[PDB]
Enzyme design. Structure first.
Site, short mmCIF file in Angstrom:
data_model
loop_
_atom_site.label_atom_id
_atom_site.label_comp_id
_atom_site.label_asym_id
_atom_site.label_seq_id
_atom_site.Cartn_x
_atom_site.Cartn_y
_atom_site.Cartn_z
N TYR A 136 -9.70 -62.23 44.87
CA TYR A 136 -10.15 -62.78 46.03
C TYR A 136 -11.96 -62.92 45.90
O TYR A 136 -11.71 -64.01 46.55
CB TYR A 136 -9.80 -62.32 47.19
CG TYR A 136 -7.86 -62.56 47.41
CD1 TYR A 136 -7.18 -63.35 47.30
CD2 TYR A 136 -7.16 -61.55 47.41
CE1 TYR A 136 -5.96 -63.69 47.18
CE2 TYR A 136 -5.95 -61.70 46.76
CZ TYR A 136 -4.91 -62.18 47.06
OH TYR A 136 -3.59 -62.35 47.37
N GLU B 60 -6.31 -67.71 42.63
CA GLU B 60 -6.84 -67.83 44.01
C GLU B 60 -8.29 -68.71 44.42
O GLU B 60 -8.06 -69.29 45.03
CB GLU B 60 -7.37 -66.58 44.65
CG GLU B 60 -6.10 -64.71 44.40
CD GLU B 60 -5.52 -65.20 44.91
OE1 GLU B 60 -5.07 -65.72 45.56
OE2 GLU B 60 -4.14 -64.85 43.64
N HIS C 39 -1.68 -72.67 44.65
CA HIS C 39 -1.03 -71.89 43.39
C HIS C 39 0.36 -72.51 42.92
O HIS C 39 0.28 -72.55 41.29
CB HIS C 39 -0.62 -70.20 44.26
CG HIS C 39 -1.30 -70.10 44.49
ND1 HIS C 39 -2.55 -68.42 43.69
CD2 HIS C 39 -1.42 -68.87 45.63
CE1 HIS C 39 -2.76 -67.60 44.34
NE2 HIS C 39 -2.41 -68.08 45.17
N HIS D 244 -1.47 -56.09 51.71
CA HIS D 244 -2.11 -55.94 49.75
C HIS D 244 -2.29 -54.64 49.03
O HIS D 244 -1.48 -54.73 48.32
CB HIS D 244 -3.78 -56.69 49.21
CG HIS D 244 -3.35 -58.53 49.51
ND1 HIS D 244 -3.70 -58.82 50.56
CD2 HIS D 244 -3.51 -59.33 48.75
CE1 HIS D 244 -3.29 -60.20 50.52
NE2 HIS D 244 -3.34 -60.52 49.62
N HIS E 298 4.43 -62.70 54.90
CA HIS E 298 3.19 -62.81 54.49
C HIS E 298 2.97 -64.04 53.03
O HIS E 298 3.96 -64.13 52.76
CB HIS E 298 2.01 -61.22 53.37
CG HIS E 298 0.87 -61.75 53.21
ND1 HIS E 298 -0.23 -61.21 54.10
CD2 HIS E 298 0.14 -62.06 52.72
CE1 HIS E 298 -1.23 -61.67 53.56
NE2 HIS E 298 -1.02 -61.83 52.84
N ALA E 299 1.87 -64.70 53.86
CA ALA E 299 2.14 -66.09 52.69
C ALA E 299 1.87 -65.90 51.14
O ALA E 299 0.87 -65.50 50.88
CB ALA E 299 0.85 -67.12 53.22
N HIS F 138 -4.51 -73.20 50.65
CA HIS F 138 -4.33 -72.23 49.35
C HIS F 138 -2.82 -72.11 48.26
O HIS F 138 -3.02 -72.20 46.46
CB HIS F 138 -5.12 -71.25 50.06
CG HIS F 138 -4.83 -69.07 49.06
ND1 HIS F 138 -5.67 -69.10 48.32
CD2 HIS F 138 -3.68 -68.57 48.91
CE1 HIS F 138 -5.21 -68.51 48.03
NE2 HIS F 138 -3.81 -67.63 47.85
N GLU F 139 -2.32 -72.02 49.44
CA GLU F 139 -1.02 -71.66 48.92
C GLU F 139 -0.14 -72.96 47.18
O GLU F 139 0.10 -72.58 46.50
CB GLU F 139 0.52 -71.36 50.00
CG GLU F 139 0.42 -70.46 50.86
CD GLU F 139 -0.03 -68.58 50.03
OE1 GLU F 139 0.57 -68.99 48.76
OE2 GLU F 139 -0.60 -68.22 50.20
N1 LIG Z 1 -7.38 -64.18 51.17
C1 LIG Z 1 -6.33 -63.56 52.06
C2 LIG Z 1 -5.17 -64.11 51.16
C3 LIG Z 1 -3.21 -63.73 51.14
C4 LIG Z 1 -2.26 -64.79 51.07
O1 LIG Z 1 -2.31 -65.39 52.30
N2 LIG Z 1 -1.92 -64.90 49.79
C5 LIG Z 1 -0.83 -64.28 48.86
C6 LIG Z 1 0.04 -63.90 48.38
C7 LIG Z 1 -0.36 -62.79 47.33
C8 LIG Z 1 1.03 -62.13 46.50
O2 LIG Z 1 2.01 -62.29 47.36
O3 LIG Z 1 0.84 -62.18 45.52
C9 LIG Z 1 -1.79 -65.39 47.80
O4 LIG Z 1 -1.67 -66.72 48.54
O5 LIG Z 1 -2.78 -65.59 47.67
C10 LIG Z 1 -5.62 -62.84 52.43
O6 LIG Z 1 -6.24 -61.11 52.77
O7 LIG Z 1 -4.63 -62.35 53.44
ZN LIG Z 2 -3.53 -66.57 46.51
#
Ligand SMILES: N[C@@H](CCC(=O)N[C@@H](CCC(=O)O)C(=O)O)C(=O)O
Ligand SMILES: [Zn+2]
Ligand SMILES: *[C@@H]1O[C@H](CO)[C@@H](O[C@@H]2O[C@H](CO)[C@@H](O[C@@H]3O[C@H](CO)[C@@H](O)[C@H](O)[C@@H]3O)[C@H](O)[C@H]2NC(C)=O)[C@H](O)[C@H]1NC(C)=O
Ligand SMILES: *[C@@H]1O[C@H](CO)[C@@H](O[C@@H]2O[C@H](CO)[C@@H](O)[C@H](O)[C@H]2NC(C)=O)[C@H](O)[C@H]1NC(C)=O
Length: 595
Positions: free
Chosen positions: A488, A376, A352, A478, A318-319, A348-349
């Site tokens: 989100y 986010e 961050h 999550h 999971h990214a 998105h990443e």
């Molecule tokens: N809306 C997407 C976003 C989820 C995602 O791809 N990555 C998370 C990792 C957060 C973590 O591990 O703490 C993030 O980048 O926020 C989904 O529900 O798939």
């Molecule tokens: Zn994120």
């Protein structure tokens, strides 16, 4: 002691806190990258170590009054350093809680599956096989098999770990003087009316979401038939291109209004132009640099994981994007694939990462988002520009074409099924978890209150009957990993406020102007927009989030105005087209979960 003297004490505390938090983050990365029981023990040991440090810091800080202090910045540094969260628990219960979570997350990351119709091929994973089956395969019985496989493997098997996690998440909230785990999460937004604000946004979104839902359901029924897709009930979720039905981008072309007019999936051009994962991150780096924002440090390229490793190790695919609380040590772990969806995840990443880089000069307890939704939102604001036909033409991913009103509907439609449908989804995940945390949802109704809420707000349902012997919430990353999800929802609202402000600064948006809409704005190469964005992000957590927002938008509140404007042309088209076609709007309650 004078405030200039207390400031020296917290400064020594800050460095202590930062070093153990870095050690803890580092051990978590190693587990995240390489799920072994040995690496799990080091992750929880380093977390236990940090938990001790934070307890001592919190006590050491109760020796300052904070009501005779005057520097507001200083009062804030002491409050955030004293916030313990889970570390408030006795160490035995702390490690019991982290072990319950890791037990869920490990089960999720390690699941493997046999191929539909071939029991001799059983190395399929979520990332990439199942993700791509749901994205691209239009065979309902195959989709149903994998949906059932996935949820049976990642949901009910971890019920007991989930129940333990809930109980100790509650103990930690009580030990911090909160009524429940839900108050803890909501506290991060620093506004006692915030739960109501979120309900108010859902109600403003609902009419638009219900028109879009109604069009998608009509088209899926024409494609798949009335026995599979009821014209009046919730949509079978396994047909929406995504295991959780959280975004429907993968069925956009399959259900688009004008399939023989230009479409906006650039995947085939990405492949045809020999795109790779690294090329994809290079282009996201370029977008940020075009905004006079920080270029990615070399540490990022050395230590990041940007493809799925080929060596058969287990890992969390999971990214994610990681801050190691040093200088320029920032990393992404992503099992990147070459398609448009993943191109947006890249951004998105990287948003961050950019946020990390912009506030890394702050003290450790300010090295976070103004609230979890700011973090986010950052990359998604870029993704809004990247998604425009304008930008995709610039970078050569979209061949030229005659633009007309129908191409514009295909574009608005894709955006709606990609982004608008996600808000009800994101809402239901924490409304559900708040209910478990608060006791409103009891263990013997865990599964049907979940699917009942998903039906009420999203109008989707499982492809088969579920029962309380199933337990499906942990099938979503999550939930198994105890990551708050309201971040989100907030992001998907405020990112349109941020986008509107940045387009204004770039001379790309004028209200009422047909040539300068929110839907065709590209802030690529607008240092004027980057500069105001930099300023907001450099604040980290040092100011209350309304002040951080005002820096970029001149407004101090979350508002759905921007996102309703963005989707108003789509809303007007759907209202008329659903009437023309005779598509039913709304839905009866799902009957797919039995108590
Ligand atoms: N809306 C997407 C976003 C989820 C995602 O791809 N990555 C998370 C990792 C957060 C973590 O591990 O703490 C993030 O980048 O926020 C989904 O529900 O798939
Ligand atoms: Zn994120
Ligand atoms: C994934 O994590 C595991 C740990 O769970 C890593 O295992 C470690 O692998 C290294 C070599 O890559 C081993 O080092 C060896 O140690 C022995 C004696 O300690 C020494 O004789 C050798 O010269 C070598 O240095 C290490 O023992 C091993 N650790 C454990 C606990 O088994 C694994 O490398 C990780 N995989 C990846 C791809 O990172
Ligand atoms: C890019 O960002 C840098 C800061 O990271 C800007 O540098 C500032 O430039 C102004 C010029 O008006 C100076 O007054 C400041 O003292 C500079 N600060 C720093 C830290 O360098 C730079 O101007 C930005 N470039 C563009 C084109 O906007």
């Amino acid at each position: 002691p004078s405030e200039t003297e207390i400031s020296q004490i917290v400064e020594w505390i800050e460095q202590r806190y930062q070093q153990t938090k870095a050690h803890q983050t580092l051990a978590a990365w190693e587990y995240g990258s390489n799920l072994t029981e040995f690496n799990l023990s080091k992750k929880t040991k380093a977390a236990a170590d940090f938990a001790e440090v934070a307890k001592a810091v919190a006590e050491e800080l109760q020796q300052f009054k904070t009501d005779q202090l005057t520097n507001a910045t200083l009062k804030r540094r002491i409050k955030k350093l004293a916030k313990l969260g889970y570390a408030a628990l006795p160490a035995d219960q702390f490690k019991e809680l982290l072990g319950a979570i890791a037990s869920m997350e490990s089960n999720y990351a390690k699941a493997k599956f046999c191929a539909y119709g071939d029991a001799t091929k059983c190395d399929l994973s979520l990332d990439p096989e199942l993700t791509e089956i749901f994205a691209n395969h239009r065979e309902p019985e195959e989709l149903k098999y994998y949906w059932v496989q996935w949820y049976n493997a990642t949901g009910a098997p971890v019920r007991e770990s989930f129940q333990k996690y809930v109980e100790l998440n509650r103990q930690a909230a009580l030990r911090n003087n909160f009524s429940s785990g839900a108050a803890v999460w909501l506290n991060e937004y620093d506004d006692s009316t915030f739960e109501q604000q979120v309900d108010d946004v859902i109600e403003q979104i609902r009419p638009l979401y219900e028109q879009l839902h109604a069009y998608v359901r009509y088209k899926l029924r024409q494609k798949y038939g009335d026995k599979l897709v009821s014209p009046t009930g919730p949509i079978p979720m396994h047909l929406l291109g995504n295991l959780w039905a959280q975004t429907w981008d993968n069925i956009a072309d399959f259900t688009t209004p004008f399939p023989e007019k230009k479409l906006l999936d650039v995947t085939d051009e990405m492949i045809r132009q020999g795109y790779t994962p690294i090329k994809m991150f290079q282009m996201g780096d370029d977008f940020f640099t075009s905004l006079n924002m920080t270029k990615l440090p070399q540490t990022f390229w050395d230590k990041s994981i940007l493809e799925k490793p080929t060596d058969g190790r287990d890992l969390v695919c999971h990214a994610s994007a990681w801050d190691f609380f040093a200088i320029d040590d920032v990393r992404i772990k992503q099992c990147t694939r070459v398609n448009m969806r993943e191109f947006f995840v890249v951004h998105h990443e990287l948003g961050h990462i950019q946020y990390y880089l912009q506030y890394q000069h702050q003290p450790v307890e300010f090295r976070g988002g103004a609230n979890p939704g700011f973090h986010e939102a950052v990359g998604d604001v870029l993704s809004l520009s990247v998604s425009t036909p304008k930008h995709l033409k610039k970078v050569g991913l979209l061949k030229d074409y005659e633009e007309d009103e129908q191409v514009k509907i295909n574009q608005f439609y894709r955006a709606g099924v990609t982004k608008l449908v996600f808000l009800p989804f994101a809402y239901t995940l924490d409304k559900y978890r708040w209910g478990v945390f608060r006791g409103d949802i009891k263990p013997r109704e865990y599964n049907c209150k979940f699917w009942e809420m998903r039906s009420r707000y999203s109008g989707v349902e499982p492809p088969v009957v579920r029962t309380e012997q199933d337990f499906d919430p942990p099938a979503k990353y999550h939930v198994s990993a105890d990551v708050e999800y309201l971040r989100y929802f907030v992001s998907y609202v405020i990112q349109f406020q941020f986008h509107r402000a940045a387009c204004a600064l770039a001379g790309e948006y004028v209200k009422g102007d047909p040539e300068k809409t929110l839907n065709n704005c590209d802030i690529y190469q607008s240092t004027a927009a980057g500069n105001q964005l930099k300023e907001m992000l450099a604040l980290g957590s040092s100011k209350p989030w309304p002040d951080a927002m005002e820096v970029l938008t001149g407004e101090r509140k979350m508002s759905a105005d921007a996102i309703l404007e963005y989707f108003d042309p789509l809303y007007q088209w759907l209202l008329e087209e659903n009437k023309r076609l005779g598509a039913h709007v709304g839905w009866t309650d799902s009957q797919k979960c039995v108590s």
